[model samples]
Target: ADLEDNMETLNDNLKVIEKADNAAQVKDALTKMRAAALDAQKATPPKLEDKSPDSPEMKDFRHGFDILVGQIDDALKLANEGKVKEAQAAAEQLKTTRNAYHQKYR
Candidate 1:
């Protein structure tokens, strides 16, 4: 369940990102979430445990996490530019990615 724990950590930070009132707060949460995403990337979920790491589903799982990393980095870029609205807007899009992957792998 370590992967689940990491997923929980990701969700918690995602909430912080959503509720963040400033770029600093948003960046903090996004950074933590990104780290968690990378950690989870190394783990094989129980749902996919039967498959080899190089399997299509495994690649897809990593691909989804990579998508998340990209989105978070995009938000971080906007936040670094002090574009709070644009940054938060990008952060909000994480929910869609989350739900989509959860459907496939959760």
Candidate 2:
């Protein structure tokens, strides 16, 4: 439940970032999302065990989480100058990442 809540928060924030008028706003939201993601991971760490990347659960859990949060810094870079289109694209990527992560990790 807590993990779900965190995912929802992150997704909600991503929507805001996507709709942001300026890159700065998007970057700010990205930062928040990054922090939230880290916190979420800490709150509910994954148990990989023998699961591999080929496993749908592993793919959704580790890979998805890794990709989404990993792109956060880059997304901020693209948003630095208020690049709305670029920010939108990055946000979409994050959304996809978030969905996959939640589906697997949660």
Candidate 3:
């Protein structure tokens, strides 16, 4: 599935980020992941034009987006603390969070 493949790619990128010893590389990876989260959030939902809060798919995506936001925040925090391993774990968590939305709604 698309979600599964994207998850794999995200993990691969996170590994590269983890192994990056320089601050610049870590910063660049953080930027890329942030941009990705933004881009993914912007994806249009064709069937959501008039959806209510109670809509299952809409709710799923909204919750997943919230989780993604949390994961991104955690990633940034870990990076700031110079905890590369923790940051990488957060990145993986983010990837999984992102894929949940893609699988459930995108």
Candidate 4:
């Protein structure tokens, strides 16, 4: 349930980014999203007795979350540097990646 809530937070943050009308708003939303991603990353995964610690599913879960954090950080950097369109584009890609992760794991 914690992981699910984390994913919902990320989805909400993405909505915030999508609705942003200015770089400042995007920057703020991205900052929040980055923090959420970090928190999610540090969270303990729910028990899965069938999956080993080194299993592909677990690795994919970690990799997907890490990628989301990296993408959000990159978007935030672009927004801070006054590249609003580029930042939005990055967010679009982040959404795509996130959807893929959901389809695979959620």
Candidate 5:
């Protein structure tokens, strides 16, 4: 299948993070998003299948994932530190990140 499944997981958990009432739910969603981003990086999206892994486009693609993964880890750290509000605020940035990257890659 295409990378759509990965996107769905990412999006689903993002919703949880955004709407979650407790820090625990936000933590759980961040955990899932981290894994989904990593797994998504392992496969090529249909749009990029024509490019080699080492190509400029692929490097940028990987960087996009890296940015997302980094952001997730940052949010997860906040959630673990008991800063649920900060963590949720941090997650607000992910929507911006997601939209920017998805515009290009999807």
Candidate 6:
């Protein structure tokens, strides 16, 4: 339930970022989403035998999470630097990554 809630938060924040008309809005949305992502990163499943830390599934999940957050960070940096279009591009990349994560894990 917590995982789903966090995923919903990320989706909501992505929509805000997508509809933002300016860099400041994008930065704000990214900031909120980054916080949500941090919380989501700490989430763990009840069963851990097959999904052990060293398992391939766990590794892939971590990799995907890192990629998604890293892209958000990049977008925030670009937005801060007054590169709105580039930041939007990075956000689009983030959307793709998020979709991939959903498809891969959900």
Highest lDDT scorer? 5
Each prediction's Cα RMSD? 1.9, 4.6, 5.1, 2.6, 1.9, 2.8
2 against 6, candidate with superior lDDT:
6
Q: Give all candidates' CA lDDT scores.
A: 0.80, 0.67, 0.61, 0.75, 0.82, 0.75
Error of 4 at 81 (Å): 0.7
How well does candidate 5 match the true structure in TM-score terms? 0.86
Model 5: per-residue lDDT, tens digit, 41-104?
A: 8878767777785788776788888888888888888878888888888877888778887777
Q: What is the TM-score of each candidate against the true structure?
A: 0.86, 0.69, 0.61, 0.79, 0.86, 0.80
Clashing pairs in 6: none
Candidate 2 global CA lDDT score: 0.67
Query: Clashing pairs in model 2?
Result: 23-82
Candidate 4, TM-score vs. the true structure?
A: 0.79
Ranking by lDDT: 5, 1, 6, 4, 2, 3
Tens digits of per-residue lDDT, candidate 3, 1-106, equal: 2234434444555666767775556656776666555555555454464678577766556566567767766777776777766777666666665466555554
How should the candidates be ordered by TM-score, best one leading? 5, 1, 6, 4, 2, 3
Residue pairs in candidate 5 whose N, alpha carbon or C atoms collide under 3 angstroms:
none
In candidate 2, what are the lDDT values of residues 78-100, reduced to their tens digit?
77765657867767777666566
Candidate 1 stretches with Cα past 4 Å from truth are: none
What lDDT score is found at residue 42 in candidate 4? 68
Clash list (residue pairs), candidate 3: none
Model 4 over residues 3-81: C-alpha lDDT tens digits?
A: 6677677778778777787889888877777777777776656543356877876756778777778778788888789
